[PDB]
Amino acid sequence: MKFIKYLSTAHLNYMNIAVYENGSKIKARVENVVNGKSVGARDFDSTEQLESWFYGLPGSGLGRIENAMNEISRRENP
Amino acid sequence: ERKLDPSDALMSAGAWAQRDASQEWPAVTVREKSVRGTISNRLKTKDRDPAKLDASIQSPNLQTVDVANLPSDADTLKVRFTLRVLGGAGTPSACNDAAYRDKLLQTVATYVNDQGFAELARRYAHNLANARFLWRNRVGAEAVEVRINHIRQGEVARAWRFDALAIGLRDFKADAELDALAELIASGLSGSGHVLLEVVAFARIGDGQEVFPSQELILDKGDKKGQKSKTLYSVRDAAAIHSQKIGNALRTIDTWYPDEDGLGPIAVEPYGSVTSQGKAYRQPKQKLDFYTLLDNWVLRDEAPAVEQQHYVIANLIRGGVFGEAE
Amino acid sequence: ERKLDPSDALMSAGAWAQRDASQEWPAVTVREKSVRGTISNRLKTKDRDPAKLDASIQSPNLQTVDVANLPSDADTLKVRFTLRVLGGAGTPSACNDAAYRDKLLQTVATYVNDQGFAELARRYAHNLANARFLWRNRVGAEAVEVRINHIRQGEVARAWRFDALAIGLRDFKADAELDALAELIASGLSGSGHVLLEVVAFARIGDGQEVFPSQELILDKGDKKGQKSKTLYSVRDAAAIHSQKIGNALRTIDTWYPDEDGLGPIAVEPYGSVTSQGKAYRQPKQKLDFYTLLDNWVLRDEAPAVEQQHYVIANLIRGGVFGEAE
RNA sequence: AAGAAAUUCACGGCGGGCUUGAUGUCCGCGUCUACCUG
């Protein structure tokens, strides 16, 4: 639903962050790129926050994708 | 009268050890004592996506950057040594006794029946060709499962030991033996005479096997993989855990049993095509098939379900007794 | 009738070993036995800022301090010896048999079909020019990937061995061979006649390759990097782990397959420009492209998806059979 | 008071960076006594 770009060269698990927009919020549905079954997402404000807390996570380079993936998969927001 | 057991369970007679792969050079074949084990090395990968997609309802913006990127996971891949040509698989399969003496007896009358059937199928049907299935389709080294593929010469050395001393010392060449039909071999009849001396409760028998695939240098293997159930989130890096003994590479006994549980071409469909692993419901895990389905009558769970009442299977008994050996 | 497999999977016939780089001097080229391996050294870098910055929302004083400072880090750059001119890459790629005999068969009728298609495309289309793709675009040493760049003379010595003895002993000069078009070479037709004797199941074939890039002294390399997933926090120093064998520098087999999986200019777009790695979805990892997209019909996952029903691909079959060789 | 279970098929990590700069470690000091390589 109103799909946009990824976060920077998945994979490393066949898992991806796969940010895509909603009409008001933006969902960050951590998912595969094969058959399609995701793990837990998180809904929040626009891309301007998405790059902000995405850059606000530790590690360098690919570890930001991975620590972002573990950070979203233990979600609070249903 | 004489109903089936409410809960029956049988010990895995004809047991099986683990394998410790360790690499060698030919003409140093005989001296496999200080032969070093093969540590599960850790390659780290990058790919494309050769997996397909479901074609029900999609948006075409996905698959361009799905396919286009680098899927790059860490893959712990067991790799050989640099200057080692041979291989290794050290497994003492010891055969227990008591082909049908149970471990649980939810009705003792059914236990007296099944001991009567080991008395019949062990008294009438001699275990010559039976253990010729458990040898001539497990000396032709289905022991070595995926690493059998294109060996120069995969030599099996089934030593056998009373004690620290070892008397039965039989040597082979498992590329001269097929995997679809068991052919007449004299020393294979000696080893099947020895498993005759095992399953019919004659002696302590533990067959120390030392299989030497003479394939090549640094090539890959087929070691038994672990799993990634609730461990692909804490680590979230590995995707194929080649399982380990203390410092070496396993072959899990779970895979190692259908090396030798591959007995019967006594299935419903095939003739000389498929020699599957002799199981209840005869299901192979590869093909997602059910050879000997419920609607057919070549089940293990129809072999005492008919034989415990009516005594007639007629030499498909072997794929209903070897379902009870393991 | 005759639907596709629910879960198909094929063994990587035409396998590939690891490389152990080791450095030499010319006219000592022939005596590459005591040639010492090249340990992955550890340089320690101080950074700069060459990366472009964002265009959405900024403040122009950030690049004063950022472009000022030094985000310095350690990089384990594998460096040559001091007085060694040559190089080394010792890889025994052994070619397995069974070009389309599967490893998983989720429907046996599809397996009989695909064995029929290896019967057609191995009976009708002879593998002369097929293995001329797997040799004339892998003897021109795409084997050596980034270290091919500006060699004096990158000499490939594909020795071939039955045993400890070695009979097929072919020598080359891979700078006299292009990487965009395969040209007519007699000894390349001998080696492709030998991979003809490999993929069509004739002999045990393991090609011990010894590639000698004669570039220079202490220059850098292109060894295969590891990763820094959840290891850039415990150590938090290294940023490029050049992966190791026992005491040497790898080329991971993952990179080493598209040395030889680079087969087909049989793609959608290019003519004589790009000779990519023959894959399902034909995706190169560099360019983030998808040559042979879903909307085009030059997929591997449309080659039996059309050929298993309608038998017509017509010599783009090779980029739909070599997708099954590996 | 558990007994059996082929987890496997394959997989480009690369791409490029000035670590640097500058320096008092010193000051004293009983190893110790004897003893058949048969």
PDB file of N, CA and C in Angstrom, chain B residues 41 43-53 63-64 67-70 72-74 77 79 81-82 146 149-152 215-220 233-237 286-289 291, chain C residues 7 11 15-18 20 90 92 94 96-97 103-108 204 225-227 229-231 241 244-246 250 252-254 279-281 283-285 288-290 293-294 300-301:
ATOM      1  N   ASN B  41      34.329 -23.877   9.348  1.00  0.00           N
ATOM      2  CA  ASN B  41      34.771 -22.570   8.886  1.00  0.00           C
ATOM      3  C   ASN B  41      33.571 -21.640   8.691  1.00  0.00           C
ATOM      4  N   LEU B  43      32.476 -18.877   6.144  1.00  0.00           N
ATOM      5  CA  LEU B  43      32.330 -17.974   5.018  1.00  0.00           C
ATOM      6  C   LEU B  43      31.255 -16.944   5.323  1.00  0.00           C
ATOM      7  N   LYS B  44      31.291 -15.849   4.571  1.00  0.00           N
ATOM      8  CA  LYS B  44      30.266 -14.818   4.627  1.00  0.00           C
ATOM      9  C   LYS B  44      29.976 -14.407   3.195  1.00  0.00           C
ATOM     10  N   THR B  45      28.694 -14.360   2.829  1.00  0.00           N
ATOM     11  CA  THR B  45      28.222 -14.425   1.447  1.00  0.00           C
ATOM     12  C   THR B  45      27.671 -13.087   0.964  1.00  0.00           C
ATOM     13  N   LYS B  46      27.271 -13.074  -0.310  1.00  0.00           N
ATOM     14  CA  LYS B  46      26.435 -12.051  -0.929  1.00  0.00           C
ATOM     15  C   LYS B  46      25.874 -12.642  -2.207  1.00  0.00           C
ATOM     16  N   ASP B  47      24.637 -12.305  -2.535  1.00  0.00           N
ATOM     17  CA  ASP B  47      23.956 -13.056  -3.574  1.00  0.00           C
ATOM     18  C   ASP B  47      23.088 -12.138  -4.417  1.00  0.00           C
ATOM     19  N   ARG B  48      22.207 -12.761  -5.171  1.00  0.00           N
ATOM     20  CA  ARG B  48      20.979 -12.195  -5.686  1.00  0.00           C
ATOM     21  C   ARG B  48      19.852 -13.025  -5.090  1.00  0.00           C
ATOM     22  N   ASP B  49      18.653 -12.863  -5.615  1.00  0.00           N
ATOM     23  CA  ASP B  49      17.546 -13.681  -5.143  1.00  0.00           C
ATOM     24  C   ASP B  49      17.092 -14.655  -6.221  1.00  0.00           C
ATOM     25  N   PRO B  50      17.558 -15.904  -6.214  1.00  0.00           N
ATOM     26  CA  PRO B  50      17.015 -16.900  -7.138  1.00  0.00           C
ATOM     27  C   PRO B  50      15.695 -17.510  -6.706  1.00  0.00           C
ATOM     28  N   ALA B  51      15.198 -17.184  -5.522  1.00  0.00           N
ATOM     29  CA  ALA B  51      13.886 -17.661  -5.133  1.00  0.00           C
ATOM     30  C   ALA B  51      12.813 -16.960  -5.957  1.00  0.00           C
ATOM     31  N   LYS B  52      11.711 -17.664  -6.192  1.00  0.00           N
ATOM     32  CA  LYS B  52      10.631 -17.153  -7.026  1.00  0.00           C
ATOM     33  C   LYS B  52       9.729 -16.197  -6.257  1.00  0.00           C
ATOM     34  N   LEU B  53       8.549 -15.917  -6.797  1.00  0.00           N
ATOM     35  CA  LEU B  53       7.561 -15.127  -6.080  1.00  0.00           C
ATOM     36  C   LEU B  53       6.167 -15.702  -6.285  1.00  0.00           C
ATOM     37  N   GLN B  63       9.659  -6.020  -6.859  1.00  0.00           N
ATOM     38  CA  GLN B  63      10.616  -7.036  -7.267  1.00  0.00           C
ATOM     39  C   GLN B  63      11.849  -6.479  -7.961  1.00  0.00           C
ATOM     40  N   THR B  64      11.799  -5.226  -8.411  1.00  0.00           N
ATOM     41  CA  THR B  64      12.962  -4.596  -9.024  1.00  0.00           C
ATOM     42  C   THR B  64      14.087  -4.429  -8.010  1.00  0.00           C
ATOM     43  N   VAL B  67      14.956  -8.015  -6.170  1.00  0.00           N
ATOM     44  CA  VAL B  67      15.946  -8.818  -6.868  1.00  0.00           C
ATOM     45  C   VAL B  67      17.272  -8.080  -6.983  1.00  0.00           C
ATOM     46  N   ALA B  68      17.229  -6.757  -7.129  1.00  0.00           N
ATOM     47  CA  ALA B  68      18.404  -6.016  -7.567  1.00  0.00           C
ATOM     48  C   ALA B  68      19.522  -5.936  -6.526  1.00  0.00           C
ATOM     49  N   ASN B  69      19.223  -6.113  -5.242  1.00  0.00           N
ATOM     50  CA  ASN B  69      20.156  -5.737  -4.185  1.00  0.00           C
ATOM     51  C   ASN B  69      21.172  -6.845  -3.917  1.00  0.00           C
ATOM     52  N   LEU B  70      21.885  -6.745  -2.794  1.00  0.00           N
ATOM     53  CA  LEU B  70      22.768  -7.818  -2.347  1.00  0.00           C
ATOM     54  C   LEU B  70      22.207  -8.468  -1.091  1.00  0.00           C
ATOM     55  N   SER B  72      23.155 -10.652   1.588  1.00  0.00           N
ATOM     56  CA  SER B  72      24.522 -10.952   1.996  1.00  0.00           C
ATOM     57  C   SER B  72      24.551 -11.455   3.429  1.00  0.00           C
ATOM     58  N   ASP B  73      24.326 -12.751   3.623  1.00  0.00           N
ATOM     59  CA  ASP B  73      24.318 -13.352   4.947  1.00  0.00           C
ATOM     60  C   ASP B  73      25.631 -14.064   5.238  1.00  0.00           C
ATOM     61  N   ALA B  74      25.840 -14.366   6.515  1.00  0.00           N
ATOM     62  CA  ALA B  74      27.004 -15.116   6.968  1.00  0.00           C
ATOM     63  C   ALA B  74      26.655 -16.596   6.981  1.00  0.00           C
ATOM     64  N   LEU B  77      30.178 -22.437   6.609  1.00  0.00           N
ATOM     65  CA  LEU B  77      30.253 -23.535   5.664  1.00  0.00           C
ATOM     66  C   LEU B  77      31.497 -24.351   5.923  1.00  0.00           C
ATOM     67  N   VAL B  79      34.422 -26.521   5.202  1.00  0.00           N
ATOM     68  CA  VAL B  79      35.279 -26.555   4.031  1.00  0.00           C
ATOM     69  C   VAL B  79      36.464 -27.440   4.388  1.00  0.00           C
ATOM     70  N   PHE B  81      40.465 -29.152   4.212  1.00  0.00           N
ATOM     71  CA  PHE B  81      41.793 -28.578   4.356  1.00  0.00           C
ATOM     72  C   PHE B  81      42.362 -28.169   3.002  1.00  0.00           C
ATOM     73  N   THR B  82      43.523 -27.521   3.055  1.00  0.00           N
ATOM     74  CA  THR B  82      44.160 -27.006   1.851  1.00  0.00           C
ATOM     75  C   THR B  82      44.774 -28.129   1.027  1.00  0.00           C
ATOM     76  N   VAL B 146      25.626 -36.617   1.127  1.00  0.00           N
ATOM     77  CA  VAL B 146      25.702 -35.711  -0.008  1.00  0.00           C
ATOM     78  C   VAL B 146      27.139 -35.619  -0.488  1.00  0.00           C
ATOM     79  N   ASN B 149      28.623 -37.581  -3.589  1.00  0.00           N
ATOM     80  CA  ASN B 149      28.421 -37.143  -4.965  1.00  0.00           C
ATOM     81  C   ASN B 149      29.758 -36.848  -5.626  1.00  0.00           C
ATOM     82  N   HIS B 150      30.093 -37.679  -6.616  1.00  0.00           N
ATOM     83  CA  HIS B 150      31.322 -37.616  -7.408  1.00  0.00           C
ATOM     84  C   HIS B 150      32.561 -37.697  -6.520  1.00  0.00           C
ATOM     85  N   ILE B 151      32.733 -38.829  -5.934  1.00  0.00           N
ATOM     86  CA  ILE B 151      34.002 -39.167  -5.315  1.00  0.00           C
ATOM     87  C   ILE B 151      34.873 -39.792  -6.393  1.00  0.00           C
ATOM     88  N   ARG B 152      36.188 -39.593  -6.287  1.00  0.00           N
ATOM     89  CA  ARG B 152      37.122 -40.476  -6.970  1.00  0.00           C
ATOM     90  C   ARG B 152      36.892 -41.924  -6.551  1.00  0.00           C
ATOM     91  N   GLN B 215      37.875 -37.592  -2.593  1.00  0.00           N
ATOM     92  CA  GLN B 215      37.385 -36.679  -3.618  1.00  0.00           C
ATOM     93  C   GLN B 215      38.424 -35.722  -4.167  1.00  0.00           C
ATOM     94  N   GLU B 216      38.831 -34.752  -3.366  1.00  0.00           N
ATOM     95  CA  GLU B 216      39.731 -33.706  -3.834  1.00  0.00           C
ATOM     96  C   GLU B 216      40.229 -32.924  -2.633  1.00  0.00           C
ATOM     97  N   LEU B 217      40.849 -31.793  -2.928  1.00  0.00           N
ATOM     98  CA  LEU B 217      41.259 -30.761  -1.992  1.00  0.00           C
ATOM     99  C   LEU B 217      40.038 -29.934  -1.603  1.00  0.00           C
ATOM    100  N   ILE B 218      40.236 -28.650  -1.327  1.00  0.00           N
ATOM    101  CA  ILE B 218      39.502 -27.778  -0.405  1.00  0.00           C
ATOM    102  C   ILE B 218      37.972 -27.704  -0.589  1.00  0.00           C
ATOM    103  N   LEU B 219      37.379 -28.577  -1.410  1.00  0.00           N
ATOM    104  CA  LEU B 219      35.944 -28.619  -1.706  1.00  0.00           C
ATOM    105  C   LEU B 219      34.991 -28.628  -0.515  1.00  0.00           C
ATOM    106  N   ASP B 220      33.716 -28.355  -0.760  1.00  0.00           N
ATOM    107  CA  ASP B 220      32.745 -28.271   0.321  1.00  0.00           C
ATOM    108  C   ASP B 220      32.325 -29.670   0.767  1.00  0.00           C
ATOM    109  N   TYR B 233      17.468 -14.202  15.548  1.00  0.00           N
ATOM    110  CA  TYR B 233      17.050 -12.908  16.063  1.00  0.00           C
ATOM    111  C   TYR B 233      18.043 -12.332  17.059  1.00  0.00           C
ATOM    112  N   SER B 234      18.624 -13.170  17.918  1.00  0.00           N
ATOM    113  CA  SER B 234      19.692 -12.705  18.795  1.00  0.00           C
ATOM    114  C   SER B 234      20.982 -12.495  18.015  1.00  0.00           C
ATOM    115  N   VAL B 235      21.368 -13.473  17.199  1.00  0.00           N
ATOM    116  CA  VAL B 235      22.550 -13.354  16.355  1.00  0.00           C
ATOM    117  C   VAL B 235      22.145 -12.707  15.038  1.00  0.00           C
ATOM    118  N   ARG B 236      21.136 -13.296  14.376  1.00  0.00           N
ATOM    119  CA  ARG B 236      20.526 -12.796  13.134  1.00  0.00           C
ATOM    120  C   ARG B 236      21.530 -12.674  11.989  1.00  0.00           C
ATOM    121  N   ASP B 237      22.589 -13.477  12.021  1.00  0.00           N
ATOM    122  CA  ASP B 237      23.620 -13.448  10.995  1.00  0.00           C
ATOM    123  C   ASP B 237      23.741 -14.774  10.271  1.00  0.00           C
ATOM    124  N   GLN B 286      12.763 -35.654   1.453  1.00  0.00           N
ATOM    125  CA  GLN B 286      13.089 -34.901   0.252  1.00  0.00           C
ATOM    126  C   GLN B 286      11.857 -34.615  -0.582  1.00  0.00           C
ATOM    127  N   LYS B 287      11.274 -35.672  -1.130  1.00  0.00           N
ATOM    128  CA  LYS B 287      10.335 -35.556  -2.231  1.00  0.00           C
ATOM    129  C   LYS B 287       8.956 -35.090  -1.805  1.00  0.00           C
ATOM    130  N   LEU B 288       8.715 -34.947  -0.498  1.00  0.00           N
ATOM    131  CA  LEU B 288       7.392 -34.687   0.088  1.00  0.00           C
ATOM    132  C   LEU B 288       6.358 -35.709  -0.378  1.00  0.00           C
ATOM    133  N   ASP B 289       6.804 -36.935  -0.618  1.00  0.00           N
ATOM    134  CA  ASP B 289       5.940 -38.016  -1.041  1.00  0.00           C
ATOM    135  C   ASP B 289       5.432 -38.780   0.167  1.00  0.00           C
ATOM    136  N   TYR B 291       5.059 -42.534  -0.165  1.00  0.00           N
ATOM    137  CA  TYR B 291       5.059 -43.931  -0.558  1.00  0.00           C
ATOM    138  C   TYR B 291       4.379 -44.718   0.545  1.00  0.00           C
TER     139      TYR B 291
ATOM    140  N   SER C   7       8.551 -27.604  -4.487  1.00  0.00           N
ATOM    141  CA  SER C   7       9.853 -27.284  -3.907  1.00  0.00           C
ATOM    142  C   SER C   7      10.903 -28.081  -4.670  1.00  0.00           C
ATOM    143  N   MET C  11      21.574 -29.606  -7.164  1.00  0.00           N
ATOM    144  CA  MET C  11      22.945 -29.557  -6.676  1.00  0.00           C
ATOM    145  C   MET C  11      23.818 -28.721  -7.596  1.00  0.00           C
ATOM    146  N   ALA C  15      31.388 -27.631  -9.307  1.00  0.00           N
ATOM    147  CA  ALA C  15      31.656 -27.019  -8.015  1.00  0.00           C
ATOM    148  C   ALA C  15      32.944 -26.206  -8.058  1.00  0.00           C
ATOM    149  N   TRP C  16      33.336 -25.687  -6.902  1.00  0.00           N
ATOM    150  CA  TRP C  16      34.392 -24.694  -6.852  1.00  0.00           C
ATOM    151  C   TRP C  16      35.038 -24.719  -5.479  1.00  0.00           C
ATOM    152  N   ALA C  17      36.359 -24.634  -5.437  1.00  0.00           N
ATOM    153  CA  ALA C  17      37.096 -24.670  -4.187  1.00  0.00           C
ATOM    154  C   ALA C  17      37.430 -23.258  -3.737  1.00  0.00           C
ATOM    155  N   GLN C  18      38.194 -23.150  -2.659  1.00  0.00           N
ATOM    156  CA  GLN C  18      38.692 -21.857  -2.217  1.00  0.00           C
ATOM    157  C   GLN C  18      40.061 -21.580  -2.810  1.00  0.00           C
ATOM    158  N   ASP C  20      43.939 -19.904  -2.246  1.00  0.00           N
ATOM    159  CA  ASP C  20      44.962 -19.576  -1.264  1.00  0.00           C
ATOM    160  C   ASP C  20      46.032 -18.768  -1.982  1.00  0.00           C
ATOM    161  N   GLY C  90      45.267 -21.052  -5.937  1.00  0.00           N
ATOM    162  CA  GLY C  90      45.173 -22.491  -6.066  1.00  0.00           C
ATOM    163  C   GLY C  90      43.773 -23.009  -5.832  1.00  0.00           C
ATOM    164  N   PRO C  92      41.080 -26.091  -6.937  1.00  0.00           N
ATOM    165  CA  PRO C  92      40.522 -27.246  -7.648  1.00  0.00           C
ATOM    166  C   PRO C  92      39.014 -27.206  -7.824  1.00  0.00           C
ATOM    167  N   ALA C  94      36.100 -28.903  -9.101  1.00  0.00           N
ATOM    168  CA  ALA C  94      35.708 -30.212  -9.590  1.00  0.00           C
ATOM    169  C   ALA C  94      34.281 -30.132 -10.093  1.00  0.00           C
ATOM    170  N   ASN C  96      30.807 -31.761 -10.917  1.00  0.00           N
ATOM    171  CA  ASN C  96      29.976 -32.917 -10.660  1.00  0.00           C
ATOM    172  C   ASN C  96      29.222 -33.311 -11.920  1.00  0.00           C
ATOM    173  N   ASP C  97      28.599 -34.474 -11.859  1.00  0.00           N
ATOM    174  CA  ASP C  97      27.812 -34.996 -12.960  1.00  0.00           C
ATOM    175  C   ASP C  97      26.393 -34.454 -12.845  1.00  0.00           C
ATOM    176  N   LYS C 103      17.987 -32.588  -6.509  1.00  0.00           N
ATOM    177  CA  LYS C 103      18.207 -32.977  -5.130  1.00  0.00           C
ATOM    178  C   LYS C 103      16.921 -33.034  -4.332  1.00  0.00           C
ATOM    179  N   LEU C 104      15.882 -32.322  -4.751  1.00  0.00           N
ATOM    180  CA  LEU C 104      14.551 -32.440  -4.179  1.00  0.00           C
ATOM    181  C   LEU C 104      13.558 -32.599  -5.318  1.00  0.00           C
ATOM    182  N   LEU C 105      12.555 -33.443  -5.111  1.00  0.00           N
ATOM    183  CA  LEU C 105      11.595 -33.812  -6.151  1.00  0.00           C
ATOM    184  C   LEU C 105      10.203 -33.703  -5.555  1.00  0.00           C
ATOM    185  N   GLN C 106       9.620 -32.507  -5.531  1.00  0.00           N
ATOM    186  CA  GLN C 106       8.307 -32.400  -4.902  1.00  0.00           C
ATOM    187  C   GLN C 106       7.191 -32.989  -5.755  1.00  0.00           C
ATOM    188  N   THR C 107       7.472 -33.332  -7.009  1.00  0.00           N
ATOM    189  CA  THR C 107       6.592 -34.135  -7.846  1.00  0.00           C
ATOM    190  C   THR C 107       7.484 -34.931  -8.784  1.00  0.00           C
ATOM    191  N   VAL C 108       7.277 -36.247  -8.835  1.00  0.00           N
ATOM    192  CA  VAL C 108       8.189 -37.105  -9.583  1.00  0.00           C
ATOM    193  C   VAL C 108       7.968 -36.949 -11.085  1.00  0.00           C
ATOM    194  N   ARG C 204      35.856 -38.683 -13.333  1.00  0.00           N
ATOM    195  CA  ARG C 204      36.207 -37.847 -12.193  1.00  0.00           C
ATOM    196  C   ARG C 204      37.135 -36.746 -12.665  1.00  0.00           C
ATOM    197  N   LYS C 225      36.130 -10.067   1.179  1.00  0.00           N
ATOM    198  CA  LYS C 225      35.896  -9.499   2.491  1.00  0.00           C
ATOM    199  C   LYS C 225      34.878 -10.311   3.273  1.00  0.00           C
ATOM    200  N   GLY C 226      35.027 -10.303   4.590  1.00  0.00           N
ATOM    201  CA  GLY C 226      34.036 -10.871   5.481  1.00  0.00           C
ATOM    202  C   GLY C 226      32.917  -9.888   5.736  1.00  0.00           C
ATOM    203  N   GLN C 227      32.416  -9.876   6.965  1.00  0.00           N
ATOM    204  CA  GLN C 227      31.373  -8.937   7.347  1.00  0.00           C
ATOM    205  C   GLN C 227      31.643  -8.345   8.721  1.00  0.00           C
ATOM    206  N   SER C 229      28.692  -7.670  10.888  1.00  0.00           N
ATOM    207  CA  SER C 229      27.351  -7.723  11.457  1.00  0.00           C
ATOM    208  C   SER C 229      27.461  -8.233  12.889  1.00  0.00           C
ATOM    209  N   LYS C 230      27.133  -7.360  13.852  1.00  0.00           N
ATOM    210  CA  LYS C 230      27.245  -7.576  15.302  1.00  0.00           C
ATOM    211  C   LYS C 230      28.657  -7.947  15.757  1.00  0.00           C
ATOM    212  N   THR C 231      29.676  -7.593  14.971  1.00  0.00           N
ATOM    213  CA  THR C 231      31.066  -7.680  15.387  1.00  0.00           C
ATOM    214  C   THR C 231      31.764  -6.331  15.309  1.00  0.00           C
ATOM    215  N   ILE C 241      37.155  -7.085   6.907  1.00  0.00           N
ATOM    216  CA  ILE C 241      37.810  -8.321   7.315  1.00  0.00           C
ATOM    217  C   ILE C 241      38.083  -9.133   6.057  1.00  0.00           C
ATOM    218  N   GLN C 244      40.113 -15.491   5.837  1.00  0.00           N
ATOM    219  CA  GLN C 244      41.307 -16.313   5.894  1.00  0.00           C
ATOM    220  C   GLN C 244      40.973 -17.795   5.839  1.00  0.00           C
ATOM    221  N   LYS C 245      41.834 -18.540   5.153  1.00  0.00           N
ATOM    222  CA  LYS C 245      42.007 -19.967   5.369  1.00  0.00           C
ATOM    223  C   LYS C 245      42.954 -20.146   6.544  1.00  0.00           C
ATOM    224  N   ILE C 246      43.536 -21.327   6.696  1.00  0.00           N
ATOM    225  CA  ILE C 246      44.492 -21.509   7.778  1.00  0.00           C
ATOM    226  C   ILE C 246      45.766 -20.755   7.415  1.00  0.00           C
ATOM    227  N   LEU C 250      41.666 -15.886   1.790  1.00  0.00           N
ATOM    228  CA  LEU C 250      40.687 -16.570   0.966  1.00  0.00           C
ATOM    229  C   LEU C 250      40.361 -15.770  -0.278  1.00  0.00           C
ATOM    230  N   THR C 252      36.454 -16.267  -1.226  1.00  0.00           N
ATOM    231  CA  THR C 252      35.305 -17.076  -0.861  1.00  0.00           C
ATOM    232  C   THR C 252      34.689 -17.683  -2.117  1.00  0.00           C
ATOM    233  N   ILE C 253      34.197 -18.922  -1.994  1.00  0.00           N
ATOM    234  CA  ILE C 253      33.635 -19.655  -3.130  1.00  0.00           C
ATOM    235  C   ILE C 253      32.404 -18.946  -3.664  1.00  0.00           C
ATOM    236  N   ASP C 254      31.733 -18.198  -2.795  1.00  0.00           N
ATOM    237  CA  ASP C 254      30.626 -17.346  -3.184  1.00  0.00           C
ATOM    238  C   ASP C 254      31.022 -16.348  -4.267  1.00  0.00           C
ATOM    239  N   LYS C 279      22.325 -16.418 -13.843  1.00  0.00           N
ATOM    240  CA  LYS C 279      21.616 -16.674 -12.605  1.00  0.00           C
ATOM    241  C   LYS C 279      20.128 -16.731 -12.876  1.00  0.00           C
ATOM    242  N   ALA C 280      19.389 -17.226 -11.895  1.00  0.00           N
ATOM    243  CA  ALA C 280      17.971 -16.935 -11.852  1.00  0.00           C
ATOM    244  C   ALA C 280      17.818 -15.444 -11.656  1.00  0.00           C
ATOM    245  N   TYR C 281      16.909 -14.839 -12.426  1.00  0.00           N
ATOM    246  CA  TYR C 281      16.643 -13.403 -12.512  1.00  0.00           C
ATOM    247  C   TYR C 281      17.816 -12.584 -13.045  1.00  0.00           C
ATOM    248  N   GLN C 283      20.562 -11.287 -12.050  1.00  0.00           N
ATOM    249  CA  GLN C 283      20.843 -10.038 -11.367  1.00  0.00           C
ATOM    250  C   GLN C 283      22.328  -9.936 -11.061  1.00  0.00           C
ATOM    251  N   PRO C 284      23.017  -8.888 -11.508  1.00  0.00           N
ATOM    252  CA  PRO C 284      24.369  -8.636 -11.013  1.00  0.00           C
ATOM    253  C   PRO C 284      24.311  -7.829  -9.729  1.00  0.00           C
ATOM    254  N   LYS C 285      25.246  -8.123  -8.834  1.00  0.00           N
ATOM    255  CA  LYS C 285      25.232  -7.493  -7.524  1.00  0.00           C
ATOM    256  C   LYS C 285      25.847  -6.104  -7.554  1.00  0.00           C
ATOM    257  N   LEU C 288      23.226  -3.118  -9.350  1.00  0.00           N
ATOM    258  CA  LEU C 288      21.851  -3.124  -8.832  1.00  0.00           C
ATOM    259  C   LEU C 288      20.823  -3.205  -9.957  1.00  0.00           C
ATOM    260  N   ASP C 289      21.183  -3.886 -11.038  1.00  0.00           N
ATOM    261  CA  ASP C 289      20.306  -4.071 -12.175  1.00  0.00           C
ATOM    262  C   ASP C 289      19.513  -5.355 -12.018  1.00  0.00           C
ATOM    263  N   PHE C 290      18.478  -5.472 -12.828  1.00  0.00           N
ATOM    264  CA  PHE C 290      17.805  -6.741 -13.053  1.00  0.00           C
ATOM    265  C   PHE C 290      17.741  -6.902 -14.562  1.00  0.00           C
ATOM    266  N   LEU C 293      14.259  -9.106 -16.457  1.00  0.00           N
ATOM    267  CA  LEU C 293      13.279  -8.796 -15.425  1.00  0.00           C
ATOM    268  C   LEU C 293      12.085  -9.760 -15.532  1.00  0.00           C
ATOM    269  N   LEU C 294      11.142  -9.633 -14.591  1.00  0.00           N
ATOM    270  CA  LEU C 294       9.906 -10.414 -14.622  1.00  0.00           C
ATOM    271  C   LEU C 294       9.095 -10.172 -15.888  1.00  0.00           C
ATOM    272  N   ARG C 300      15.403 -17.548 -15.604  1.00  0.00           N
ATOM    273  CA  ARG C 300      15.486 -18.980 -15.331  1.00  0.00           C
ATOM    274  C   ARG C 300      14.151 -19.493 -14.845  1.00  0.00           C
ATOM    275  N   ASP C 301      13.473 -18.742 -13.999  1.00  0.00           N
ATOM    276  CA  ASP C 301      12.195 -19.214 -13.502  1.00  0.00           C
ATOM    277  C   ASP C 301      11.037 -18.945 -14.473  1.00  0.00           C
TER     278      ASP C 301
END
